Amino acid sequence: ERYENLFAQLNDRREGAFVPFVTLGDPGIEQSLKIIDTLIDAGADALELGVPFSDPLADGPTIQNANLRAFAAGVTPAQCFEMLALIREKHPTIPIGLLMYANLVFNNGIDAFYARCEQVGVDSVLVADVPVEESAPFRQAALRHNIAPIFICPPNADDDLLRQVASYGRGYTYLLSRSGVTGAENHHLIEKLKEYHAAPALQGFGISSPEQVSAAVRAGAAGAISGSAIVKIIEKNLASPKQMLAELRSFVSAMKAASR
């Protein structure tokens, strides 16, 4: 719904979507909420939010540290859902996607996690360590609660995977620009995904420069996701909240500008 709407609008304005990713609670609750409000104000079209997990095995150093900072702040999944509600209360239309690790979703029951996402206003959920082969229980629970189950299309994707990602996914398709893990300092698919009517593709991993966003949209992607590049600005300005928000505004506006 929110993704459909966002994508319809962006298409009319002939522009791509810029989606920043940050870890909920980094460096703290109050500052995280401020960081998020600044990202939206600065031009973000949607948000990709991570819930601090103890063993983020699909994450590079930058984001591994973000989780640590979050834990150091006493941040828990329960507190995240509290933040999630406050964010939705402030911004009714921005799509909100969660980047999760399987255990946090499985913990208190799969269906119960999605029910909570729904009541909080979350739009999509990407479970990093759940491949399409093991997704049945997860996507069904997501569908039952009107949450879009997001799937990753890796570069080494064969046709069969392509078809599955296209029919199982919703909201958007996460397109991996490379193998490896998340890290800022690190087309055939796009066409096939379109052919199979996959949800709009959002490219992620390594997107840190404005020209990368332009190129992604030019390649056929509906937008780009950028995480480590954003999180790095947070860690580098820990001692000064003010400069952190200022630099965040600047980077985000420059990145969104490039989406047009």
């Binding site: 103890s54 095995l57 255990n103 491949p131 990753i152 991996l176 193998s179």
Partner: protein, 390 residues
């Protein structure tokens, strides 16, 4: 789809980022063909025999059981090259790696024994070895680290998270997700995503096959029970495998109880943890009420895996195998007792298995029972530890 079932009942699976599935599928396929390849088996058996020292002896304890009706035999994996059972499987995974055209090896290690075994197999077979180890363990396992380096392996400390084994497991998967094309991930236990639980068991299965033939030869009958400690589950499943269909044989797994189950400071996820999804599998584990993964505690560093192999969680659920725990103090006493009465220094890990056999004997001295304990390793490495405590 896969060629083999990735699940043992509800436990198991392949919960890894999508990017790694093809690596997993390639491995399962290579394994299935190797398993049918006579040339591969001959090669594996050759190395096990002429390089590792198989078959290991089955020693009857004649002093320790005096005054009871318990006959206790010890499967001597402590006599295996490397001083532990881990050697069997790393040699097989290394041959698998070559079979796939892989030239590098990635490995995770806690106490350091898997690191050492991975390093020695790599040096022998001409593979480049990369080893991940939690910074805290690197610090406490200075000897094993030098051993790994001495064998040409690269040892990379992991300062993320708790900086222990689970964090090293994370880094190895991270590394592999980007290098699976030229490198093979040599997982250290019968856990993780399919097909590792299955592969590691099949490459440790000779322990139980040898024991069966050896006991049949010496006692003319199958044991009443075979006992093994369970850190991640490889030595145990290696011992159990060949006896699973012999329903008359009890299968007993012993998890570390640390300072005591009720203290919360243990490493017995199978019986005192909760099912979760981590390290590419659905299995019971040490985790908070929130779902955050926690460390396993034990006097023996080699039983630090915060979870357990899926086939064990399964065998338990259907009641085919029983799992118990043994505290630090009980393991210590068993360690001292074996040194003094049999002249064998056991690994503190294996002492957990021995301590339970001792308990079965002592609690019912007139019960006639034929027991086999899997002496997974030697305890030279534990000498100082037991020293200070004493």
């Amino acid at each position: 789809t896969t060629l083999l079932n990735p699940y043992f009942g509800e436990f198991g699976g392949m919960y890894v980022p999508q990017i790694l599935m093809p690596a997993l599928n390639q491995l399962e396929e290579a394994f299935v063909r190797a398993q049918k390849d006579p040339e591969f088996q001959a090669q594996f058996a050759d190395l096990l025999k002429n390089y590792a020292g198989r078959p290991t002896a089955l020693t009857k304890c004649q002093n320790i059981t005096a005054g009871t009706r318990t006959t206790l035999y010890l499967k001597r994996e402590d006599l295996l090259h490397g001083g532990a059972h881990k050697t069997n499987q790393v040699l097989g995974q290394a041959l698998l790696a070559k079979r796939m055209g892989k030239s590098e090896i990635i490995a995770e290690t806690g106490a350091g024994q898997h690191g050492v075994a991975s390093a020695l197999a790599s040096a022998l077979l001409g593979l480049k070895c990369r080893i991940y180890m939690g910074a805290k363990d690197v610090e406490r396992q200075s000897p094993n680290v030098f051993r790994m380096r001495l064998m040409g392996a690269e040892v990379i400390p992991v300062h993320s998270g708790s900086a222990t084994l689970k964090d090293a497991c994370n880094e190895a998967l991270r590394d592999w997700s980007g290098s699976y094309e030229t490198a093979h991930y040599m997982l250290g236990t019968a856990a993780g995503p399919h097909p590792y639980p299955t592969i590691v068991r099949e490459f440790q299965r000779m322990i139980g096959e040898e024991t069966k033939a050896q006991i049949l030869d010496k006692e003319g009958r199958l044991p009443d029970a075979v006992i093994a400690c369970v850190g991640g589950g490889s030595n145990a499943i290696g011992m159990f495998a060949d006896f699973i269909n012999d329903t008359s044989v009890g299968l007993i797994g012993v998890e570390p109880g640390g300072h005591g189950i009720e203290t919360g400071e243990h490493g017995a996820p199978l019986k005192h943890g909760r099912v979760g999804i981590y390290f590419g599998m659905k299995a019971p584990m040490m985790q908070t009420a929130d779902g955050q993964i926690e460390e396993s505690y034990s006097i023996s560093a080699g039983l630090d895996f915060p979870s357990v192999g899926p086939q064990h969680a399964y065998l338990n659920s259907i009641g085919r195998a029983d799992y118990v725990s043994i505290t630090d103090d009980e393991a210590l006493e068993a360690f001292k007792t074996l040194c003094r009465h049999e002249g064998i220094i056991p690994a503190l890990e294996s002492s957990h298995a021995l301590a339970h056999a001792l308990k079965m004997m002592r609690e019912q001295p007139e019960k006639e029972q034929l027991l086999v304990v899997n002496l997974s390793g030697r305890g030279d490495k534990d000498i100082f530890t037991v020293h200070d405590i004493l």
